[PDB]
Amino acid sequence: NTNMRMITKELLLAQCDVVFLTLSKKDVQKSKEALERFDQALLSVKQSVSGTDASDLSVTFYEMRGHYYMHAGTLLLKMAQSCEVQWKALIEPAALCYLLAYQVPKPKSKPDNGQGFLEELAFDRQSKSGHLLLTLSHGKQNFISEIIETFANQCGQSILLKFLFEDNLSMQDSFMGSDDISYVENRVPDLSELSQHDNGSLRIHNGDLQHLTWLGLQWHFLSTLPPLRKWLKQIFPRVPQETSRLESNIPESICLLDLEVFLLAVVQTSYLQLQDNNTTANRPRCLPLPICKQLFTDRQRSWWDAVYSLITKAKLRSVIQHDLTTLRAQEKHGLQPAVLVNWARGLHKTGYSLNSFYDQKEYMGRCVHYWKKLLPLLDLVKQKKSIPEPVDPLFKHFHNKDIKVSEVKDLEDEACIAFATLDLVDGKTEDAIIAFESVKNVVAYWNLALIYQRKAEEIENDCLPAEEQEEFQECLLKCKGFLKMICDEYSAYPSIATSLPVPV
């Protein structure tokens, strides 16, 4: 009875998704037929059994309403791609469809009928809809205009119904007309809620390389690094966070930082590859998960599958061992500088942000290791071949990776600052100063002033003029609008200027 009305909606949803992606219906009869059956079932269940608060039909109906609008958006984008490419007329219909799904509220009875399914489906729908609503509406003031236009009493839903089912369904009857939408308002997803929705969506995509690289790419498009450690702690719970030795290429000593580094590299290589794939001559940069093609190459897939088979278990591990040698910058690697430098900067930031001492050291140890392994190779930049890689080992790109002769100096300075900071977070506070008195950028000045303050809370007076002149240096350097410091001088400069005047 009502239970079959419950389950058929779920099965028709799975049918719609499968017919959409793997069956690769080319936006022709194949997929639109499933969508039409879905819409018919929706109107049928809504009009007759208007479930109240008590029956679960109402909450399942709400979740499938959100999912129906999401799939409407995906079908619009597929039509646009198949015909020519994502048009200028099929992103706003699609943007409105993505919005409504996120806006209908996550289902929670909180008292049998495993609400877990609806909970994780809400996780997934919100994650997807939000990531595709930010990447479509990258420019602001776009949501407000779409909300006040593409929707209206009937015209808005008419121009959204005709596209999906071309004149095979009446407007008033058996359609989306009976559903009212005017109840939705402007509310772009939050960058904190989005990360938790992704951390939840990882509950139905355990270790899917495609899904992970898609999420990584979507975060990368928003110009903020993704939270790789939460996801990697969810996927793999137990894996050690570091290793005893970085000099040994042994397969059964996988550290979580290795997988973090591998995912960083895959995300950047796939991003550059698509960037060169005639996207410069397509409005959705990343093309939602089911419609888009493979983002990683084949060797990455083989290695990740071997790693997953090792972790979550006559095993041939030559791929593990070979790419581990590649990963730890060991005996002989084909990767050029662009990859090592990205690795080092990422580990640097991720470690420095955190507070736990046994975590900052770990991030600074791996960071200094990568910079010191870059040290000799970047020296081979004297009108010389970097590394002959006629074959592509794992990550080989050109016209980007090649570090020109000029930029060497800055990487040297960053490596020295990494050395100083590593030793400063170990307790050798004197040679920390020693090393910080060679590089002459603003990071050095700020770190020196900070160590002067901490060591000398209530020690001496004349050590304060050290802080005085170093923050005067940083003042002149602020005069040039230099925002390179981790905390902007709006906060450091005022506090230090105050402390200097108060001590005076």
Q: What is the DSSP string of 265-278?
A: HHHHHHHHHHHHTT
Q: Which two tokens stand for residue 181?
A: 């939408």
Instruction: Bin 139: left if φ > 0, else alpha if -120 < ψ < 50, else beta.
Output: beta
| One domain, residues 187 and 261 | no
| One domain, residues 178 and 258 | no
| One domain, residues 30 and 70 | yes
Tell whether 368 is covered by a domain: no
- Whether the Cβ atoms of residue 451 and residue 433 lie closer than 8 Å to each other: yes
Q: Which two tokens stand for residue 106?
A: 């996550």
| One domain, residues 242 and 157 | no
User: Structurally, how many domains does the chain consist of?
Assistant: 3
Tell whether 412 is covered by a domain: no
Tell whether 373 is covered by a domain: no
Which of 156, 177, 204 is the endpoint of a domain?
A: 204
Domain around 24: 2-204
| One domain, residues 45 and 102 | yes
CA angle, corner 367, sides to 365 and 370, nearest 5? Answer: 110
| One domain, residues 91 and 134 | yes
| One domain, residues 123 and 219 | no
Which of 204, 224, 256 is the endpoint of a domain?
A: 204
d(CA 148, CA 186) in angstroms, rounded, equals 10
DSSP symbol at 223: T
- Whether the Cβ atoms of residue 41 and residue 26 lie closer than 8 Å to each other: no
Amino acid sitting at position 240? P
| One domain, residues 7 and 46 | yes
DSSP symbol at 286: S
Tell whether 431 is covered by a domain: no
Tell whether 422 is covered by a domain: no
For residue 494, the tally of other CB atoms under 10 A from its CB is 10
- Whether the Cβ atoms of residue 161 and residue 171 lie closer than 8 Å to each other: yes
Resolution in units of Å: 3.0
Q: Which two tokens stand for residue 197?
A: 């929705």
DSSP symbol at 53: S
Which of 175, 204, 233 is the endpoint of a domain?
A: 204
| One domain, residues 225 and 200 | no
| One domain, residues 194 and 252 | no
- Name residues whose C-beta falls within 8 Å of residue 355's C-beta, 6 or more positions apart in sequence: none
Tell whether 165 is covered by a domain: yes
| One domain, residues 77 and 136 | yes
- Whether the Cβ atoms of residue 69 and residue 60 lie closer than 8 Å to each other: no
Query: What is the dihedral sign for C-alpha 150, 156, 161, 167?
Result: negative
Q: Which two tokens stand for residue 112?
A: 């049998």
Tell whether 383 is covered by a domain: no
φ, ψ of residue 335 in degrees (nearest 5): -60, 140
- CA dist list (Å): 389 to 303, 333, 336, 386, 396: 19, 9, 10, 9, 8
Tell whether 403 is covered by a domain: no
| One domain, residues 61 and 141 | yes
Provide the experimental method for this PDB entry.
cryo-EM
